[PDB]
């Protein structure tokens, strides 16, 4: 559990200016740095300044766009993504238009993700795509949203916004990672769990899914992330802090 907890901590996207600064401080933990912090776009500049000032410039800055709604207006999602890039994001987590998919429109999800990926790729920014598994609910829809996102060039597929009633489950995590495996894209596509990981014991289980599917070396920071309320504290407690 100590080994899994240290591993999970180093895979976290940890999520007023004073609160952003505090977040950056919290990412620099006694046992190592989280992979990233996650803030709203407007907070990226002050976060970058803080991370540099505390000597942790390698902590990535992630942000969110089309968020949390997953609306199907490509031009708005793209403008927000371009703004996130311009603010200085290292990574952008865009919400997939999951309601449109549930209404039978697969193409708009492809087009939205693709537009955002093209912007991100031009700037060497990673794109994560939030599919909102807790709203999709159905295995087939979770697979479909995952598949479309991957085909459109997602660098990560992500369970959830954290803003709806149901976020990640072990089953939705397994389904999404199976899509990565089945599509043969494990080298280029990561998986991010949001919600459902309250404890160090939970984190261990989610990591074990990846280890079982791909082998224990797969889940590095380019391929696996965590975000959940309370998780950092639980991980630190497991590690003696």
Q: Is 93 tagged catalytic?
A: yes
Yes or no: say if 223 and 191 are a contact pair by the CB < 8 Å rule: yes
C-alpha span between 56 and 90 (Å, rounded):
14
C-alpha span between 53 and 18 (Å, rounded):
15
How many CB atoms within 10 Å of residue 84? 29
Contacts of 108 (CB under 8 A, 6+ apart): 72, 74, 97, 100
Burial class (CB in 10 A: 0-12, 13-18, 19+), 184: exposed
Q: Per DSSP, which regions of the chain are E strands? A: 13-14, 28-29, 32-33, 36-38, 60-65, 91-95, 126-130, 156-158, 190-194, 224-227
3-state secondary structure of 103: coil
Q: Is 158 tagged catalytic?
A: yes
Q: How was this structure determined?
A: X-ray
The two beta strands, 32-33 and 28-29, are antiparallel
What is the total count of domains within the chain? 1
Query: Of 169, 74, 159, 73, which Cα lies nearest the Cα of 117?
Result: 74
List the alpha helices (DSSP H) in 129-219.
133-136, 139-151, 170-183, 200-214
C-alpha span between 150 and 43 (Å, rounded):
28
Q: Is 128 tagged catalytic?
A: no
3-state secondary structure of 95: strand
Two structure tokens written together for 21: 């600064």
Yes or no: say if 126 and 120 are a contact pair by the CB < 8 Å rule: yes
What is the structure's resolution, reported in angstroms to one decimal?
1.4
Q: Out of 111, 114, 192, 202, pick the active-site residue.
A: 192
- CATH code for position 44: 3.20.20.70
Q: Out of 93, 111, 155, 202, pick the active-site residue.
A: 93
Domain that holds residue 49: 2-238
Yes or no: say if 214 and 179 are a contact pair by the CB < 8 Å rule: no
């Amino acid at each position: 559990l100590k080994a899994s907890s240290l591993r999970a901590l180093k895979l976290m996207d940890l999520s007023t200016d004073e609160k952003v600064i505090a977040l950056c401080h919290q990412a620099k933990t006694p046992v190592g740095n989280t992979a990233a912090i996650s803030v709203y776009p407007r907070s990226i500049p002050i976060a970058r300044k803080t991370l540099k000032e505390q000597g942790t410039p390698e902590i990535r800055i992630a942000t969110v766009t089309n968020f949390p709604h997953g609306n199907d207006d490509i031009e708005i999602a793209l403008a927000e993504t371009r703004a996130a890039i311009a603010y200085g994001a290292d990574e952008v987590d865009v919400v997939f238009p999951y309601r449109a998919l549930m209404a039978g429109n697969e193409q708009v999800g492809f087009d939205l993700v693709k537009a955002c990926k093209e912007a991100c790729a031009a700037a060497n920014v990673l794109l994560k795509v939030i599919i909102e598994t807790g709203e999709l609910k159905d295995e087939a829809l979770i697979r479909k949203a995952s598949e479309i996102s991957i085909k459109a060039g997602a660098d990560f597929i992500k369970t959830s916004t954290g803003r709806v009633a149901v976020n990640a489950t072990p089953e939705s995590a397994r389904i999404m990672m199976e899509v990565i495996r089945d599509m043969g894209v494990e080298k280029s596509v990561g998986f991010k769990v949001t919600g459902g990981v309250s404890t160090a014991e939970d984190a261990q289980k989610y990591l074990a899914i990846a280890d079982e599917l791909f082998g224990a070396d797969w889940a590095d920071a380019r391929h696996y992330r965590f975000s959940a309320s309370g998780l950092l504290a639980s991980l630190l407690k497991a590690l003696g802090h």
